[PDB]
């Protein structure tokens, strides 16, 4: 669809470090260049190099090819929120089930929302998944370490954002509604969701889910969506024309002092007047979910595949 701040990365050496950038726009310019999945792959699976070469994040493979929230460059994926500190894409475990559907063959990284959070799978350097995804066989097309972005697969239609934390009573109220709505479900991804005197084995479960910032997610069938825009400082990226993201020192000056160029919308809330320029991020805004008479701004809203267990009694 196009990037937020920075065009696709053109890396030189796989051994080059990952300079961690605190500046928000700088953190999003890494996200545009998949420097975050690059880090995760390194931090969690002996991966030497980067993902996203030439293509960038705008080229990551999404399992639901009909991915709606991907067309919006500014809607954050699970991984993209891992870089900003909203969710940790936990490394997989022998018990974290890989969902069927995605063409895993050749993937270097892939990720899926799980009922209790987010889980990713990495392959080591010069390695790539099998068609089932549970091993990392050899792949001569991965020796470079400067791998394409198609080698990154993000499972599910997912949108992440700053969440209004909800009283825990709400969550439990929501979990109670999710249980009356989904009585057949006994477990989701290994997390108890109801009680059954007879449970069938794990089963693919395409479900609209929601992260309200609590233990598990709130899975949904009858729910309403609606998008907003707070025009807050996190919905605006800052950049120096031609030279990429503005420094952290320049950004705060832009988004506080108001002595910076910018789009209409920035100007109309922050101010304007060689210099730094800030703009809006490409997104409908913040997703608000109506559910069981209550609306909640989720940390992440989305429709994704999960492995769940249904009753037999």
């Amino acid at each position, epitope marked *: 669809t196009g990037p937020i701040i920075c065009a696709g990365p053109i890396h030189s050496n796989k051994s080059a470090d990952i300079p961690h950038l605190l500046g928000y726009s700088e953190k999003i310019c890494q996200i545009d260049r998949l420097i975050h999945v690059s880090s995760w792959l390194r931090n969690h699976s002996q991966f030497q190099g980067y993902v996203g070469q030439r293509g960038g994040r705008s080229q990551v493979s999404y399992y639901p090819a009909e991915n709606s929230y991907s067309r919006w460059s500014g809607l954050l994926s699970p991984c993209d929120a891992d870089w900003l500190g909203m969710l940790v894409v936990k490394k997989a475990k022998g018990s974290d089930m890989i969902v069927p559907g995605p063409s895993y063959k050749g993937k270097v990284f892939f990720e899926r929302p799980t009922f209790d959070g987010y889980v990713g799978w990495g392959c080591g350097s010069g390695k790539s998944r099998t068609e089932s995804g*549970e091993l990392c066989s050899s792949d001569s097309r991965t020796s470079s370490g400067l791998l394409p972005s198609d080698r990154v697969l993000w499972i599910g239609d997912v949108a992440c954002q700053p969440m209004t934390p909800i009283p825990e009573e709400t969550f439990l109220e929501l979990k109670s509604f999710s249980q009356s709505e*989904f009585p*057949d479900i006994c477990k989701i991804d290994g997390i108890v969701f109801n009680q059954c*005197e*007879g449970e*069938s084995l794990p089963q693919p479960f395409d479900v609209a889910w929601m992260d309200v910032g609590h233990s598990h997610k709130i899975i949904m*069938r009858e729910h309403k969506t609606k998008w907003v825009q707070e025009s807050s400082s996190k919905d605006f990226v800052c950049y120096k024309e031609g030279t990429g993201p503005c420094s952290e020192s320049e950004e705060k000056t832009c988004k506080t002092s108001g002595s910076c160029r910018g789009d209409m919308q920035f100007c109309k809330v922050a101010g304007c007047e060689a210099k730094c320029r800030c703009s809006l991020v490409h997104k409908p805004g913040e997703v608000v979910v109506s559910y069981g008479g209550m609306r909640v701004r989720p940390k992440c809203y989305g429709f994704s*595949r999960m492995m769940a267990t249904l009753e037999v009694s």
Partner: antibody
Amino acid sequence: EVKLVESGGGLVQPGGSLKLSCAASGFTFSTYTMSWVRQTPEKRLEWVAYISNGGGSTYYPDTVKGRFTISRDNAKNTLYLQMSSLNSEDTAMYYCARSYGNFDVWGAGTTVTVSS
Amino acid sequence: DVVMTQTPLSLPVSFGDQVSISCRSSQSLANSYGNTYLSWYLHKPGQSPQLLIYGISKRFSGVPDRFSGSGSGTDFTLKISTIKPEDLGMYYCLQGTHQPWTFGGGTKLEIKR
């Protein structure tokens, strides 16, 4: 009570087409993956087609891949198997089933006889 | 694909007998999570296939305690501790751990005389 009732079975001509409809009642259709199973006259059961709950994923064995198309409208809580390129080897009682390695609820079946 | 071979194909049975139905798979029906999606179905004449056992040994509810499954790996077995007339029919084993899912050859429980 969990009830699946298939419909659309009858005589078809070789190479012709027939679509089977599975009407689902007594459960939350959209939270179950579903599948179609046939029984040849020699009483052999065969897995025919599978579909996720949201219809996004389908699977077939190469015996009926590209010839059949499974589909489901959760809105009407109905499962569908569009059968094309039919042959006398497609002579069977086609059952629809609540699915994923455990066909825990089956339909009454619908006889599809491919014969010129 | 995963060839499910069912022994016996025909099994003469008398009421009160305990009968065994063995199903041996070409490959290991243990996936990479230890989950084995092998299920046993009963198909009585003129009715629909009914799920008896799923997941090797877990009884579908509505199925009497006389039906029991067991096994691991390649060879799996269905066990009816006490045959009753309502159990006669064709019994099928079925994988689901690997695609394509494959049923077994079938076991006709017929009356021994």
